[PDB]
């Protein structure tokens, strides 16, 4: 299949779906690493 974005989109989608729909925090917590 032609799937090449659900990995990058899911990163931002969860940020607007978790802090809004109280969903899970996949990329809204792990921040101990900077750079």
């Amino acid at each position: 299949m032609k799937l090449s974005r659900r990995s990058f989109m899911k990163a931002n989608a969860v940020a607007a779906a978790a802090a809004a729909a109280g969903l899970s925090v996949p990329g809204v917590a792990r921040a101990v690493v900077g750079q």
């Binding site: 659900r6 989109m9 899911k10 931002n12 989608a13 969860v14 940020a15 607007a16 779906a17 809004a20 729909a21 109280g22 969903l23 899970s24 996949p26």
Partner: protein, 90 residues
């Protein structure tokens, strides 16, 4: 991967339905071409599914399915996904 970004219209909608209801209908959204489940989580019986269409008029059409589906008790779609320019919020 190098330069390569181009899209027409698509966003992520959070369908809210019974915990085992969404598995039936939510999983279906992933089977459709336009609609596609991006994040599948069972925090309260709601999953995230993105849908793309000619324009917003067609995009909202899909919501009629999840909203009219009994298993769906609520619907919170808030997320713009398109490559072209920046001028909105998260």
């Amino acid at each position: 991967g190098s330069h390569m970004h181009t899209n027409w219209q698509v966003c992520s909608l959070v369908v809210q339905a019974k915990s085992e209801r969404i598995s039936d209908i939510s999983t279906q959204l992933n089977a459709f071409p336009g609609c596609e489940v991006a994040v599948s989580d069972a925090p309260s019986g709601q999953l995230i599914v993105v849908v793309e269409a000619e324009d917003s008029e067609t995009l909202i059409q899909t919501i009629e399915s999840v909203r009219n589906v009994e298993g769906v008790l609520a619907v919170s779609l808030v997320y713009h996904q398109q490559e072209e320019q920046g001028e909105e919020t998260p």
